[PDB]
């Protein structure tokens, strides 16, 4: 069957792991255990197609930035995550996009911009600001909450739909 290789990237603490675990395992991880690099695989049906999602949950801690080249080489699509209550994490997206662009040698890599923690009210990144960033990259913007499940399936399935357009 068709396999989609997804990679979840973004600054430390934005909720990459919580998002991935909510999608795959249907529960919310409340505690904060920084990731080195973890892999998840699950067979799902997306738009009538039975397929395998292979998801790489990467490290946001800058200590592990040397690992990025390898996972960017292998990935077919990237979920670029920031948190809506963390302006620095939003600013950090560009360095992830720029490396993906360099490694892929392409301005047309399948990607989705994700604003996580939308259940929280301490918002410093307004929706339109993120819409504008996503527009500049030619990709969709979606808000999610790993805590409430809002938008979670949508974000990952949208990324699959972006891979299919390339
Ligand atoms: N309220 C709320 N908290 C969230 C949400 N997503 C993640 N968190 C919380 O934010 C913290 C960090 O989440 P985590 O998934 O570990 O972040 P990460 O991006 O994987 N970190 P790292 O890059 O270090 O691996 C955890 O305490 C988690 O419960 C969300 O949507 N809403
Ligand atoms: Ca829990
Ligand atoms: Ca692009
Ligand atoms: Mg993590
Ligand atoms: Mg502002």
UniProtKB/Swiss-Prot annotation:
A Pfam family hit: Ras
Stored SMART domains: RAB, RAS, RHO
Glycosylation sites per record: 35
Effect of residue 61 to L: In melanoma; strongly reduced GTP hydrolysis in the presence of RAF1; increases transformation of cultured cell lines
Consequence when changing residue 89 to C: Found in a patient with severe fetal hydrops and pleural effusion; uncertain significance; decreased activation of Ras protein signal transduction
Subcellular localization, as worded in the UniProt entry: Cell membrane; Golgi apparatus; Golgi apparatus membrane
Effect of residue 17 to N: Dominant negative. Prevents PLCE1 EGF-induced recruitment to plasma membrane. No effect on subcellular location of isoform 2
Mutagenesis / variant outcome for changing residue 118 to S: Abolishes S-nitrosylation. No stimulation of guanine nucleotide exchange
Modified residues (S-nitrosocysteine): 118
Motif interval(s): Effector region: 32-40
Assembly and interaction partners: In its GTP-bound form interacts with PLCE1. Interacts with TBC1D10C. Interacts with RGL3. Interacts with HSPD1. Found in a complex with at least BRAF, HRAS, MAP2K1, MAPK3 and RGS14. Interacts (active GTP-bound form) with RGS14 (via RBD 1 domain). Forms a signaling complex with RASGRP1 and DGKZ. Interacts with RASSF5. Interacts with PDE6D. Interacts with IKZF3. Interacts with RACK1. Interacts with PIK3CG; the interaction is required for membrane recruitment and beta-gamma G protein dimer-dependent activation of the PI3K gamma complex PIK3CG:PIK3R6. Interacts with RAPGEF2.
Record's disease association: Costello syndrome: A rare condition characterized by prenatally increased growth, postnatal growth deficiency, intellectual disability, distinctive facial appearance, cardiovascular abnormalities (typically pulmonic stenosis, hypertrophic cardiomyopathy and/or atrial tachycardia), tumor predisposition, skin and musculoskeletal abnormalities.
Name of the molecule in the record: GTPase HRas
Species lineage: Eukaryota, Metazoa, Chordata, Craniata, Vertebrata
């Amino acid at each position: 069957m068709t396999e989609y290789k997804l990679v979840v990237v973004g600054a430390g603490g934005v909720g990459k792991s919580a998002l991935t675990i909510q999608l795959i395992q249907n529960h919310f991880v409340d505690e904060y255990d920084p990731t080195i690099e973890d892999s998840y695989r699950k067979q799902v049906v997306i738009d009538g197609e039975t397929c395998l999602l292979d998801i790489l949950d990467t490290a946001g801690q800058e200590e592990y930035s040397a690992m990025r080249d390898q996972y960017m080489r292998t990935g077919e699509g990237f979920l670029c995550v920031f948190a809506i209550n963390n302006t620095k994490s939003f600013e950090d997206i560009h360095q992830y996009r720029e490396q993906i662009k360099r490694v892929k040698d392409s301005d047309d890599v399948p990607m989705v911009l994700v604003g996580n923690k939308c259940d929280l009210a301490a918002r410093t990144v307004e929706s339109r600001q993120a819409q504008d960033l996503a527009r500049s990259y030619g990709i969709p913007y979606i808000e999610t909450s790993a805590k409430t499940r809002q938008g979670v399936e949508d974000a990952f399935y949208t990324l699959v739909r972006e891979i299919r357009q390339h």
